Amino acid sequence: RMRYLTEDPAGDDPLQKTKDEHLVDLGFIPKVFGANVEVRKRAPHDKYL
Amino acid sequence: RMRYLTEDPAGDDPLQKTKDEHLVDLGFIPKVFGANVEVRKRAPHDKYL
Amino acid sequence: MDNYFTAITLLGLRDQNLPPFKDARLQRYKSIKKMIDLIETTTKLAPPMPVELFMLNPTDPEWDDDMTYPTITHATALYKSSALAGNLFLYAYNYNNFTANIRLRTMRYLFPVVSLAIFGNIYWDYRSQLVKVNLFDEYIQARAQELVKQNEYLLEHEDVKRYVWWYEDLKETLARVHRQANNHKACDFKDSEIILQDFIRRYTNPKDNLPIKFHPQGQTF
Amino acid sequence: MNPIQKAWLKILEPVSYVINEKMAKRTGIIGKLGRFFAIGPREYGVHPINRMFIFMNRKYMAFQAVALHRYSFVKSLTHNGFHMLRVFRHFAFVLPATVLAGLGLFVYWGDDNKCYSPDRFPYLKKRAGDMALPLNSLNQRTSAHYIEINAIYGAEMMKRYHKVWENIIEERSKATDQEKKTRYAHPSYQYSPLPVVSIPNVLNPLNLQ
Amino acid sequence: TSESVLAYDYKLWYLWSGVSNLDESFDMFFNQYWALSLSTSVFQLFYAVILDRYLSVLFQNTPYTNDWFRMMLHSKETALIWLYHPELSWHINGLNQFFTYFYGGILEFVYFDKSNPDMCILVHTLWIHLLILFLIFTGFVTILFSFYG
Amino acid sequence: KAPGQIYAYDIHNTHYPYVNIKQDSQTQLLASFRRSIASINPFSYRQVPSQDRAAFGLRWGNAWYAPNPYPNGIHFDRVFPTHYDPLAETNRTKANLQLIKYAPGNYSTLVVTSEKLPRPCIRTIQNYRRCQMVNGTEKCNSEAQDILAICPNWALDHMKEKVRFYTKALAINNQTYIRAMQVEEYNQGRTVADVAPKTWIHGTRQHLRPDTMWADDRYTNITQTEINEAIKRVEARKAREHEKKPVEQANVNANTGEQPVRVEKSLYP
Amino acid sequence: DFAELLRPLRSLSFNQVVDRYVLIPPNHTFYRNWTYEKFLGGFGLSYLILRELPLRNFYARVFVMYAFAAKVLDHLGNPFPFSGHGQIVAAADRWNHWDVRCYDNVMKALKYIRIPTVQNNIPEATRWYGRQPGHLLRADTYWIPNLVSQRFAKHQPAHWDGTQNMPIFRLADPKHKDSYMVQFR
Amino acid sequence: YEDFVFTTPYFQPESTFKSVPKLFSDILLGGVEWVYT
Amino acid sequence: MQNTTNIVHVPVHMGHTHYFDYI
Amino acid sequence: MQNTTNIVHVPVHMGHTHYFDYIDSFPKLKEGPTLEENHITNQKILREQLISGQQGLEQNLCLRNCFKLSQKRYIEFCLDRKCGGADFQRAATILGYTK
Amino acid sequence: TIFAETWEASEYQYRNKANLKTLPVNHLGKLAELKFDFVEYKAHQLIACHLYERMTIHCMNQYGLFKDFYRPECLDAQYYFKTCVELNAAYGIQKKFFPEHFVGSPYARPVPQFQQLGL
Amino acid sequence: TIFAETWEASEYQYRNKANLKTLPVNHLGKLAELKFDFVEYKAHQLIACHLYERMTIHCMNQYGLFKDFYRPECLDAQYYFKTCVELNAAYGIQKKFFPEHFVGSPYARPVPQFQQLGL
Ligand SMILES: CCCCCCCCCCCCCCCCCC(=O)OC[C@H](COP(=O)([O-])OCC(O)COP(=O)([O-])OC[C@@H](COC(=O)CCCCCCCCCCCCCCCCC)OC(=O)CCCCCCCCCCCCCCCCC)OC(=O)CCCCCCCCCCCCCCCCC
Ligand SMILES: CCCCCCCCCCCCCCCCCC(=O)OC[C@H](COP(=O)([O-])OCC(O)COP(=O)([O-])OC[C@@H](COC(=O)CCCCCCCCCCCCCCCCC)OC(=O)CCCCCCCCCCCCCCCCC)OC(=O)CCCCCCCCCCCCCCCCC
Ligand SMILES: CCCCCCCCCCCCCCCCCC(=O)OC[C@H](COP(=O)([O-])OCC(O)COP(=O)([O-])OC[C@@H](COC(=O)CCCCCCCCCCCCCCCCC)OC(=O)CCCCCCCCCCCCCCCCC)OC(=O)CCCCCCCCCCCCCCCCC
Ligand SMILES: CCCCCCCCCCCCCCCCCC(=O)OC[C@H](COP(=O)([O-])OCC(O)COP(=O)([O-])OC[C@@H](COC(=O)CCCCCCCCCCCCCCCCC)OC(=O)CCCCCCCCCCCCCCCCC)OC(=O)CCCCCCCCCCCCCCCCC
Numbered sequence A, B: 001r002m003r004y005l006t007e008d009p010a011g012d013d014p015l016q017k018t019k020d021e022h023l024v025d026l027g028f029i030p031k032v033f034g035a036n037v038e039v040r041k042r043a044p045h046d047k048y049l
Numbered sequence C: 001m002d003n004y005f006t007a008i009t010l011l012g013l014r015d016q017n018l019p020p021f022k023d024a025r026l027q028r029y030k031s032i033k034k035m036i037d038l039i040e041t042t043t044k045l046a047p048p049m050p051v052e053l054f055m056l057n058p059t060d061p062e063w064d065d066d067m068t069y070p071t072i073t074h075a076t077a078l079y080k081s082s083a084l085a086g087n088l089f090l091y092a093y094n095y096n097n098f099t100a101n102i103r104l105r106t107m108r109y110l111f112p113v114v115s116l117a118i119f120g121n122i123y124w125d126y127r128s129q130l131v132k133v134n135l136f137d138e139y140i141q142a143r144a145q146e147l148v149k150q151n152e153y154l155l156e157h158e159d160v161k162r163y164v165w166w167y168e169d170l171k172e173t174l175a176r177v178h179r180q181a182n183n184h185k186a187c188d189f190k191d192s193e194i195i196l197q198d199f200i201r202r203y204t205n206p207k208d209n210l211p212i213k214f215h216p217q218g219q220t221f
Numbered sequence D: 001m002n003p004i005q006k007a008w009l010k011i012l013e014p015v016s017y018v019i020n021e022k023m024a025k026r027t028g029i030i031g032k033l034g035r036f037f038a039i040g041p042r043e044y045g046v047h048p049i050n051r052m053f054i055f056m057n058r059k060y061m062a063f064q065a066v067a068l069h070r071y072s073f074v075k076s077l078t079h080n081g082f083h084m085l086r087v088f089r090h091f092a093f094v095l096p097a098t099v100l101a102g103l104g105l106f107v108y109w110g111d112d113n114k115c116y117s118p119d120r121f122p123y124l125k126k127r128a129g130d131m132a133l134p135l136n137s138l139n140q141r142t143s144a145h146y147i148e149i150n151a152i153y154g155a156e157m158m159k160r161y162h163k164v165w166e167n168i169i170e171e172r173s174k175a176t177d178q179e180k181k182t183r184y185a186h187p188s189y190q191y192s193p194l195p196v197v198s199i200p201n202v203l204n205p206l207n208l209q
Numbered sequence E: 001t002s003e004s005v006l007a008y009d010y011k012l013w014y015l016w017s018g019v020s021n022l023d024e025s026f027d028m029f030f031n032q033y034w035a036l037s038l039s040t041s042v043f044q045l046f047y048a049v050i051l052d053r054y055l056s057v058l059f060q061n062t063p064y065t066n067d068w069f070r071m072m073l074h075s076k077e078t079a080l081i082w083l084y085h086p087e088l089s090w091h092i093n094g095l096n097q098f099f100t101y102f103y104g105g106i107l108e109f110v111y112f113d114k115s116n117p118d119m120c121i122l123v124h125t126l127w128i129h130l131l132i133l134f135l136i137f138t139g140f141v142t143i144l145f146s147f148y149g
Numbered sequence F: 001k002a003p004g005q006i007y008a009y010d011i012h013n014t015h016y017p018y019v020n021i022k023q024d025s026q027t028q029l030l031a032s033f034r035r036s037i038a039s040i041n042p043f044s045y046r047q048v049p050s051q052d053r054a055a056f057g058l059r060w061g062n063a064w065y066a067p068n069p070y071p072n073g074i075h076f077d078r079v080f081p082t083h084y085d086p087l088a089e090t091n092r093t094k095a096n097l098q099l100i101k102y103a104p105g106n107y108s109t110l111v112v113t114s115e116k117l118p119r120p121c122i123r124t125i126q127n128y129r130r131c132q133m134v135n136g137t138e139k140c141n142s143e144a145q146d147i148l149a150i151c152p153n154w155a156l157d158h159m160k161e162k163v164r165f166y167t168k169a170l171a172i173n174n175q176t177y178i179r180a181m182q183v184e185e186y187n188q189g190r191t192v193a194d195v196a197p198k199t200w201i202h203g204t205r206q207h208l209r210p211d212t213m214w215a216d217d218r219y220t221n222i223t224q225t226e227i228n229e230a231i232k233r234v235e236a237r238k239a240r241e242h243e244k245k246p247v248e249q250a251n252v253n254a255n256t257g258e259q260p261v262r263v264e265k266s267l268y269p
Numbered sequence G: 001d002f003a004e005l006l007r008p009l010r011s012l013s014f015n016q017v018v019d020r021y022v023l024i025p026p027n028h029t030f031y032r033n034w035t036y037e038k039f040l041g042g043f044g045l046s047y048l049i050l051r052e053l054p055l056r057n058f059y060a061r062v063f064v065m066y067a068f069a070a071k072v073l074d075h076l077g078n079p080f081p082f083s084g085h086g087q088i089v090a091a092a093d094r095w096n097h098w099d100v101r102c103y104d105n106v107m108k109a110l111k112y113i114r115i116p117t118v119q120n121n122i123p124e125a126t127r128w129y130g131r132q133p134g135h136l137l138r139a140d141t142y143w144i145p146n147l148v149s150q151r152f153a154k155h156q157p158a159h160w161d162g163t164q165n166m167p168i169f170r171l172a173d174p175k176h177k178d179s180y181m182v183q184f185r
Numbered sequence H: 001y002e003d004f005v006f007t008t009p010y011f012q013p014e015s016t017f018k019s020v021p022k023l024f025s026d027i028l029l030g031g032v033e034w035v036y037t
Numbered sequence I: 001m002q003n004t005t006n007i008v009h010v011p012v013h014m015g016h017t018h019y020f021d022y023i
Numbered sequence J: 001m002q003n004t005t006n007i008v009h010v011p012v013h014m015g016h017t018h019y020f021d022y023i024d025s026f027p028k029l030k031e032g033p034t035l036e037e038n039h040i041t042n043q044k045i046l047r048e049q050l051i052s053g054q055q056g057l058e059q060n061l062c063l064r065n066c067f068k069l070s071q072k073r074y075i076e077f078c079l080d081r082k083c084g085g086a087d088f089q090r091a092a093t094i095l096g097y098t099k
Numbered sequence K, L: 001t002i003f004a005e006t007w008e009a010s011e012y013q014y015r016n017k018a019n020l021k022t023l024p025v026n027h028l029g030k031l032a033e034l035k036f037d038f039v040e041y042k043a044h045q046l047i048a049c050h051l052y053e054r055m056t057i058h059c060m061n062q063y064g065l066f067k068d069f070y071r072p073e074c075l076d077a078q079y080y081f082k083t084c085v086e087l088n089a090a091y092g093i094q095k096k097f098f099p100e101h102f103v104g105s106p107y108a109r110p111v112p113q114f115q116q117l118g119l
């Protein structure tokens, strides 16, 4: 369970992801969402570890 | 002039910049802009090189 | 842990001692949480003053010269002087041969010509370095006075008086702040909150969307 | 033996008496210690550096005598003294000129002794703690005029601010609590008097001028 | 790069310890106003706020706020002026914000090294260098150009 | 044309204060002897700098002194994990190549700095503001395009991010304003008129007694008899206050395979 | 003792304090580093007198020189050449690095220890400034084509056009057409 | 403000009293890599 | 950034033993 | 990502020579006037500026120095105190900052 | 500002940057190096940077500021105190305006809302 | 899709990713390796992946598909043709839906609007 909940920092390169500056020029204005600060990470049942 | 107009890719680390999810939780909803595709980079006068 | 001296002062550690038990000692830490938010806000209401008061604008074209600091290479001049002296010892140590042996006549004849040219290079560089240093020292002093007499008037602006009056109001305001009790609660500074709120309400408008407005010559830290 | 060794003897004359006469023969360890630090003629006291100079001085000087002792190029031009056909007469003064240039071998050793080093890039690395810098560091520089002129400007202007600062504190001391809390205040502020308390008007807490 | 190198050198360290009254690294303002705040006074809390604003000024080591460029109230020369005019911390924090907003870059966090290394430019160090090479050249002559035996 | 002297020279009045930090008899006696002959001693080294002559730092015997680096738990292992604790030893042991490498900056602090934008990019910004206050914003298009073109892109990103930071700090300062200007339940309806004519000294130890029994001589004349009686009165008040007790809540961190809440720790284990 | 530190300031006015300790007349002609030359140069001068000790036993002077080397190695550190640098703690004064205050890269290298990010790269601004090519002299005797060609070259006056970046020489860039023979490593 | 315009969206003062329970998260300098030999 | 860097969400206790580092 | 990677915004031509890599030319490079021609051209401007561009200069310099200030309210203070009660818009037209 | 005597070290370590410094607790071992006699209460040794402050006072009372305060046990306390308040001032500011840089902050790696997942 | 015979080599290189492949022009040198006689027009050799196709047809006409087509000059043309149209199909899709990946696109490194600078 600890290694399931052991993540690495910074994730992946945001520059390899779709840009918001491009979606605007494509016709879709993205909506800005806030951070979900109420969720607690937990491990699944043992059978999935 | 060529080395003034010689940049490197990817700029700086985005994760070290202000997040949009954080501004929303602070009370400021950021506005999304579009890319400026009309500007052409040029070198300044020789005295500034 | 910012605002260290302010917090240590509010807890009373400058005159008394904290309770030896964790229950009350910890409540006393949480009691100043309001006052820190207040004193930090007060420190961000200072009015602006001309930046061109104790600091010349570095973006001025006058400073595009990108001038360097002229120096004197004493260590270089001393080594080359000791090396030239070494040649005089080599001639002295071998005086009888250079002087009496005709196979070394060319050295006896031209050794002093080369030594003078070496000395000339040594002293020429030192002398030139010295002249440039003096030309630099006398210019920075003359040009500094012209810039002073030019910008003295900036001290006559009323914003300098406005800046000092704000600093004194904060001194008199913080001098009136006092601890009202020792119950280890936020109510120990009950009356002081009203005093500081009056100070903040005196330089801001609480009934606005952004009572603290941003301007490039303002306070952020 | 040399004069510098003799000078040590006159200075260490009493020390030698204590080690060689008393300690060097008393008994046991005090003997081994005194006989080990005995004072006298140096065993293997020769100085190889002195000798190294004497040898290289002599060998290089024998070379100077050969290189400098050449038949003249000027005298061979007339075809009247000792030289009719000399197809390499123009090489006569090459070795002499090469030996005379050797007098600057040590005077001009390294880059710093051949130019004004502060105008060269390697000087910046030495002043940066022998640290690698970009090659264009000599150009990205702020004017030395600004750094020194602004340092004087800031101070000459502070002496004038100190006098202005005093006149303001004085004029404010003669002001009413109502005036000093409404002047320069926000328009939306409503003045409400505070209880009067004793708060001194001290210019400098430290007893300075 | 490839340039002349010495065999033995000395590196100086202009340490900004802040605990030595022999040099200019002694923070006279901080030590005076700190001891002033220890004694019971009516301005005891005011002096604390002053010291906290002074620390927020050292925290801003920008081109316009640093000792390298000899800026007022940031260099060793103007350390005593803090004793007379401690009210100028706000002016500094605002000035640095004005130039940073218009003519500056992003405020980045870095570690300020107080140890200030500098290679001492000496004369005798090159004498030692020549002596070492003189021994190396003599061996070249002693081994290959010695005809005394 | 006398050389300039620093403020430290007027405290000691000499350039040769033989300050050695090593507190051994051999060292302090030699310093006192060397401190007296520094005027006519060729083996004299300065420790107070001047305009004409540099100086040395503090001496440690024959070597030089520097304070112990501020404790830093960051380290790098080479052969085996050392578990370096900077609080377990007074002086930091030297770093052996095969054992440990310490963090950089033995003597370093945390500051915030900023890069200086290119000079030509600065001149375009000066020209925009100048044309703005003179001709207005609507007539500064040419000066705005020169900025976007001459200023390198890395600078435009900095300018773009400065606005987002100051926008963030602007909110962080206004949230503190709201918490600071909030009127608590214990100050409802109270104004400056209800404030007492007291200053900071009136909340100190001389005027306001601390919450300790031996701060002054208040309880120095108390006897065991008076104590037994006081224990009876406090127990009397508890006959009316102990009637209430908070109810036990559920443990939000009951599941060990769940990210626990950083709940306030108990005063005692 | 805190009041004893301010004794010279109570007798002075603010203008006298500035003119005394702040506005010191600039004079950059002194040999400030003589303090270090005298101290460290004394090791060599001391070795001249110490190598002449009348100690008879050769191995007793081995001990003396071992003690003298210990005194030096407390400052020099590494006994081998071309290995490292000595360590001298010096006093901090306004004249530290006084002749290089104009250079920006020297300040960053001495002062700033930058924190590496996840996107492990040198700051783009630092990389961009680093591409602005420095000035490299044309004079070159190491490349035999220039050793011959530059003997027939005519040095013409370069009339100042009002700038500080006139490329009257070649540029220190590997891709410059007059510097491609230089190895940048 | 003082002859300067700083465009910002409408500030929501309600975000000040946003309930954000702190969560546990420990960083381990010295851990596991992706592959081992 | 350090290669052996991990972020853990649940508490762990490390052994204070010489020559070893483990949970 | 290759460490020696650069993004260039102007055309460059690389030489295809063995053992060497460099920029041998720039497309459509025009050789301007020589340093001597620009020198002569500039001296004609400085000569006229020295003979006919030195009257009424002290006033223009004060106006230029006033406009190098940070805030507008300080400029008006500089004009009224140093430039003899000048107007902001009237001085900006002289300096050529007006459209 | 820290409103307690104890703080979680991970809360003052960076999540997206290399960790080259920590915010350690007061070094209680330095308190035993003072040779003279002094009175110190255990209730004041845990609060950040205050122990080094009281030690500096004890050393400035026993000794002065000239030729007697210059001993290793007293100068390290003054250097620690001066260094502790500078680091804590910067960390406190960085926590106030850059809370997303530190571990434990929900903004260092924001968790998305369920509306952003497309389910 | 490419609507010409020529394409800028940089327009198909990645800006934020390592460049491990190029999109080269047709290898005309492979056309001179065919020993037999054939008719080829220069107007068809520059278009992408087509030259390898025509060469494959010429080799499948002169020889067949069994024991005579299995020679290096003919198998490399079949492999180049099968590989050229696979890469170009992938590069074409990456150009259609991921134009921000390539050099020359204004979205690879978006230039901000002037309203984002705060002037
Ligand atoms: C572990 C590494 C350590 C490294 C650091 C230490 C390095 C140590 C190496 C030392 C080697 C040099 C020796 C330095 C002195 C130490 C004492 C010593 O010499 O050894 C013991 C030495 C005994 O020699 P020995 O090795 O024991 O055995 C003897 C041999 O068997 C037979 O006897 P001999 O007489 O036939 O042999 C002579 C003997 C000893 O000969 C000597 O007497 C040594 C003389 C050294 C020069 C001294 C004058 C230098 C100029 C002074 C300028 C003053 C400037 C300031 C002016 C005032 C204003 C500020 O050997 C040498 O000559 C050695 C010379 C080495 C070369 C020096 C020149 C090389 C120049 C190349 C360029 C390098 C530039 C740097 C040079 C720096 C110079 C400052 O003592 C004496 O000789 C006593 C001499 C008494 C009479 C001398 C009267 C004064 C003469 C002055 C010179 C007059 C000539 C013209 C000068 C004009 C000046 C303007
Ligand atoms: C006012 C103050 C008070 C004064 C009053 C008191 C008066 C008392 C005076 C007392 C004594 C004065 C000493 C001189 C009198 C000597 C009388 C005598 O009977 O002695 C015979 C005496 C007897 O021989 P020795 O005793 O057996 O040995 C004598 C020497 O040790 C070694 O003898 P060596 O013959 O073996 O030496 C040969 C060496 C002698 O050293 C020199 O003199 C240097 C020569 C450099 C000049 C060469 C001229 C070449 C012709 C060019 C034609 C055009 C000229 C235009 C000039 C324009 C200038 C901008 O010359 C060479 O190396 C010959 C090879 C030349 C190079 C090979 C290639 C040549 C063609 C290159 C063409 C390149 C063109 C390219 C482009 C062209 C496009 C159009 O021989 C001498 O000539 C003694 C000369 C001693 C040296 C004097 C110079 C000392 C250095 C002074 C510093 C420089 C200042 C002068 C510079 C002059 C212009 C560069
Ligand atoms: C299989 C078994 C064999 C295996 C053996 C082991 C393998 C090797 C293991 C290596 C271990 C690692 C090495 C250490 C790592 C660190 C390396 C390093 O950083 O070096 C950088 C350093 C940088 O220099 P660079 O990168 O090569 O060149 C750049 C610059 O040019 C340099 O600076 P610069 O531009 O300022 O210099 C300008 C130049 C200026 O020069 C000139 O302008 C003209 C030349 C004037 C020469 C004058 C000499 C000075 C004294 C003259 C006085 C007498 C005058 C005579 C008449 C003169 C006529 C004019 O000045 C000189 O460099 C003069 C050099 C003189 C050398 C002697 C001439 C003959 C060549 C050497 C032959 C002997 C060595 C070959 C051994 C073969 C054995 C098989 O390298 C050196 O140059 C130093 C060489 C020594 C390094 C090794 C030191 C190891 C430490 C332990 C030994 C300590 C010495 C004790 C000797 C005791 C003898 C009994
Ligand atoms: C009429 C006959 C005479 C009757 C009178 C007899 C009485 C004479 C004595 C009274 C008059 C003396 C005149 C000068 C005033 C000095 C007063 C004073 O207190 O000095 C103490 C003086 C300095 O005290 P310090 O502050 O502790 O500095 C030394 C520290 O080591 C430094 O440690 P550091 O780490 O801080 O610094 C390192 C140091 C480097 O220091 C070291 O490397 C030395 C380290 C020691 C060796 C390492 C092993 C450790 C040994 C420990 C055990 C030693 C016990 C010795 C006990 C001696 C007790 C006094 O480098 C420097 O800092 C700069 C030094 C270079 C500066 C320039 C020096 C110029 C000297 C001018 C010489 C002029 C005379 C000519 C010389 C001879 C010419 C042939 O200490 C000494 O005793 C130095 C001894 C050096 C040997 C001198 C040998 C020559 C003496 C010549 C006498 C007169 C001519 C004789 C002619 C022969 C026929 C008569």
Ligand SMILES: COC1=C(OC)C(=O)C(C/C=C(\C)CC/C=C(\C)CC/C=C(\C)CC/C=C(\C)CC/C=C(\C)CC/C=C(/C)CC/C=C(\C)CCC=C(C)C)=C(C)C1=O
Residues within 6 Å of the ligand: C087, C090, C091, C094, D004, D049, D053, D056, D057, D058, D060, D061, D064, D102, D103, D105, E124, E127, E128, E130, E131, E134, G041, G043, G044, G045, G048
């Ligand atoms: C003139 O013609 C020529 C010759 O003559 C034929 C040559 O021999 C030669 C060959 C030259 C040589 C063989 C000499 C080569 C010398 C070289 C390479 C350098 C030698 C270096 C050393 C011996 C090491 C010296 C080390 C130092 C000086 C560092 C420490 C300082 C010391 C020892 C001195 C202290 C410094 C001072 C300024 C104080 C000076 C002290 C004195 C003068 C005291 C003197 C005392 C007495 C008793 C005389 C040439 C090239 C030549 O051109």
Ligand SMILES: CCCCCCCC/C=C/CCCCCCCC(=O)OC[C@H](COP(=O)(O)OCCN)OC(=O)CCCCCCC/C=C/CCCCCCCC
Residues within 6 Å of the ligand: C074, C077, C078, C081, C082, C084, C085, C119, C122, C123, C126, F052, G029, G030, G031, G032, G034
């Ligand atoms: C007989 C004389 C032989 C001398 C050697 C022959 C060649 C002479 C070559 C002359 C070249 C002169 C060029 C100028 C070099 C400049 C030197 C220099 O800058 O020194 C400066 C500086 C002056 O200090 P400041 O006041 O800060 O500077 C003010 C500048 N006006 O001088 C110094 O560095 C002091 C040290 C001087 C050299 C070393 C002195 C010691 C000499 C050793 C031998 C003497 C032994 C006996 C000493 C007695 C001790 C009790």
